[PDB]
């Protein structure tokens, strides 16, 4: 526990403290070792409607690392653990197959950032 | 009671021996306390019991065996109820068997909460307040962790769902 | 002294839906302490 | 295992079941815990 917690970070869930373990410090105790665990816990959850794939041209994109999250007006991609909204673009997505097969999909725009720089 | 039995004369000799009589009882009690602690550690992983969502839709995954049945008494799932039949345990003379701090019924609720927690909130419940997520979407995250891209799950969810259902 | 039936926790069902997701907007860093024994007194008893 | 496998996916190989690990569902038995492990295995292969 000390070797994983003090040196390095442990991916194992709940092995060291509760929640994600950023780092740990150990304090000597009589006939014992005490470990203080620093962990990250997400306090607030704002409800957002979500869908797995967005179909732009009959090809559906998926997030490189972010669950698609939409307030309901527009669709932006944010990291699943903190709410950062980024305008969906080719850089944050990859397209595989045709958008007929995926069970849940929402039509949405793509920015194509090369075009405004070109024009 | 075991060694001397009911007779008073037998008891007096036991007193001569010492705290052996007293020491043995203490050791057993320590063992008895430990059993409760083990069960507590293993199953009390959740702060709050999570009721299963009324909607049974889980993107084509059938969880009927795993989840608790309201119609059935004792709130034990079909897989769980089958298991109880498999292992069957089947006072007398100074030996007493004490019932578990957690009643089998209570243990059932803890298991359901974890099951309910896993399906509804993924791994979010383990590390903090449970966050609702689509089950298909949760599975998508799971594939990513093992190196198979999320799109792969979505492309043939139906194939995957059938295999899982068949496997269960 | 009163004897209760030992309720395990508050019963809340997280809202669930195929199209509904929840994502955290703020985070809290906390410190938790776990205590493990590493040693006990060493006693040597001469048997004689 | 309960903490490690039910709550989150376990990276450690063979820690849960056999093969790649997706998720686990806890079960209750008399004086025991029965774990159901969901794992991903590759069924078919080709040379390249
Ligand atoms: C999920 O679980 C089982 C397997 O498909 C189905 O439940 C069956 O329901 C019918 C009556 O509707 C009963 O005849 C069977 O007893 C049930 N199965 C068994 C094995 O007993 C259920 O239909 C499946 N899914 C849903 C969505 O209901
Ligand atoms: C995140 O939560 C933290 C902690 O509650 C917030 O920090 C507080 O913000 C209020 C209002 O600005 C301050 O008056 C307090 O001094 C801050 N500290 C605490 C402990 O309350 C923070 O504002 C929240 N972040 C977001 C982005 O809303
Ligand atoms: C998210 O879900 C609820 C559903 O009752 C919604 O009304 C509200 O915006 C949020 N509150 C929650 C999960 O408590
Ligand atoms: C996303 O929704 C919020 C809440 O309705 C709104 O304030 C915000 O403007 C939306 N995003 C954009 C780009 O408008
Ligand atoms: C979500 O589930 C509801 C159940 O009422 C259904 O009407 C709807 O078509 C489903 N949508 C998706 C995208 O699965
Ligand atoms: C998305 O666009 C397709 C045609 O490309 C159309 O069939 C579909 O109904 C649209 N759906 C929504 C729900 O906006
Ligand atoms: C790759 O090579 C072997 C050679 O014996 C061939 O028979 C087969 O196509 C491939 N092998 C496996 C092991 O699938």
Q: What is the DSSP string of B114-144?
A: HHHHHHHHTTHHHHSS-----HHHHHHHHHH
The H-assigned helical ranges of chain B are: 8-17, 20-43, 78-86, 104-121, 124-127, 135-145, 150-155, 157-167
A60: β partners: A55
Q: Which of C19, C24, C40 sits opposite A42 (nearest CB)?
A: C24
Distance of CA A105 to CAs A55, A65, A68, A101, B154, Å?
A: 7, 17, 10, 9, 10
Element of type H or E holding A117: helix A114-118
For ligand 4, whether the C-beta of A71 sits within 6 Å is: yes
Chains that touch C (3 or more CB pairs under 8 A): A, B
Query: How many residue pairs from chains B and D have C-beta atoms closer than 8 A?
Result: 74
Whether A31 has its CB under 8 Å from any CB of chain C: the answer is yes
Whether A40 has its CB under 8 Å from any CB of chain D: the answer is no
A2 close to A35: Cβ distance less than 8 angstroms: yes
Whose Cα sits closest to atom 6 in ligand 5? Answer: C18
> A43 and C18 in contact by Cβ < 8 A?
no
Q: Which residue has the tokens 């974890």?
A: B114
For ligand 1, whether the C-beta of B62 sits within 6 Å is: yes
Q: Give the span between the Cα atoms of A90 and A109, in whole angstroms.
A: 11
A42 close to B125: Cβ distance less than 8 angstroms: no
Six-digit token pair at A1?
Answer: 């526990």
Q: Give the span between the Cα atoms of B64 and B77, in whole angstroms.
A: 8
- Counted residue by residue, chain B has a size of 168
B11 close to B3: Cβ distance less than 8 angstroms: no
Q: Give the span between the Cα atoms of B83 and B76, in whole angstroms.
A: 10
Distance A106 CA to ligand 6 centre (A): 8
- Counted residue by residue, chain A has a size of 119
What is the widest separation between alpha-carbon atoms in chain C?
A: 78
Nearest CA in chain C to B51: C13
Six-digit token pair at B66?
Answer: 């795993």
To one decimal place, what's the resolution in Å? 3.4
**Residue B69: how many CB atoms within 10 A of its CB?**
15
> B146 and D22 in contact by Cβ < 8 A?
yes
User: Structure solved using which method?
Assistant: cryo-EM
Distance of CA B87 to CAs B80, B90, D37, Å?
A: 11, 9, 21
B61 close to B53: Cβ distance less than 8 angstroms: no
Six-digit token pair at A3?
Answer: 């070797």
Query: How many residue pairs from chains A and C have C-beta atoms closer than 8 A?
Result: 102
Distance C15 CA to ligand 3 centre (A): 7
Six-digit token pair at B43?
Answer: 């199953």
- Starting at the edge strand found earlier in the chain, the sheet holding A60-63 runs A93-95, A60-63, A53-55, A105-107
Whose Cα sits closest to atom 1 in ligand 3? Answer: A47
Nearest CA in chain B to C11: B49
Rounded to 5 degrees, φ, ψ at C27 are -130, 150
Please state the separation of Cα B95 from the chain's center in Å. 28
Q: Give the span between the Cα atoms of C35 and D15, in whole angstroms.
A: 25
């Amino acid at each position: 526990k000390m070797s994983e917690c003090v040196l390095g970070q442990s991916k194992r869930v709940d092995f060291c403290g509760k929640g994600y373990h950023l780092m740990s410090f150990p304090q000597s105790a009589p006939h014992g070792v005490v470990f203080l665990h620093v962990t990250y816990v997400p306090a607030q959850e704002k409800n957002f409607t979500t869908a797995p794939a967005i179909c732009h041209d009959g090809k559906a994109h998926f997030p490189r690392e972010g669950v698609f999250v939409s307030n309901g007006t527009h669709w932006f991609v944010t990291q699943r653990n903190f709410y950062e909204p980024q305008i969906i673009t080719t850089d944050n997505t990859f397209v595989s197959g045709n958008c007929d097969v995926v069970i849940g999909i929402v039509n949405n725009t793509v920015y194509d950032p090369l075009q405004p720089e070109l024009d | 009671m075991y060694i001397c039995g009911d007779s008073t004369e037998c008891s007096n000799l036991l007193l001569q021996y010492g705290s052996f009589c007293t020491q043995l009882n203490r050791a057993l009690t320590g063992i008895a306390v430990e059993q409760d602690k083990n069960t507590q550690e293993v199953f009390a992983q959740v702060k709050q019991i999570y009721k299963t969502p009324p909607i049974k839709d889980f993107g084509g995954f059938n969880f009927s065996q795993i989840l608790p049945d309201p119609s059935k008494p004792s709130k034990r799932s079909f897989i769980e109820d089958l298991l109880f039949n498999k292992v069957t345990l089947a006072k007398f003379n100074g030996l007493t068997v004490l019932p578990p701090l957690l009643t089998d019924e209570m243990i059932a609720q803890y298991t359901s909460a974890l099951l309910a927690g896993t399906i509804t909130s993924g791994w979010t419940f383990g590390a903090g307040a449970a966050l609702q997520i689509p089950f298909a979407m949760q599975m998508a995250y799971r594939f990513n962790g093992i190196g198979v891209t999320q799109n792969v799950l979505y492309e043939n969810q139906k194939l995957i769902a059938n295999q899982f259902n068949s496997a269960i | 002294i009163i004897a209760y039936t030992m309720s395990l926790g508050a019963e809340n069902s997280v809202a669930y839906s195929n199209n509904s997701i929840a994502i955290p907007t703020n985070f809290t860093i906390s410190v938790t302490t776990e205590i493990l024994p590493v040693s006990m007194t060493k006693t040597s008893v001469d048997c004689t």
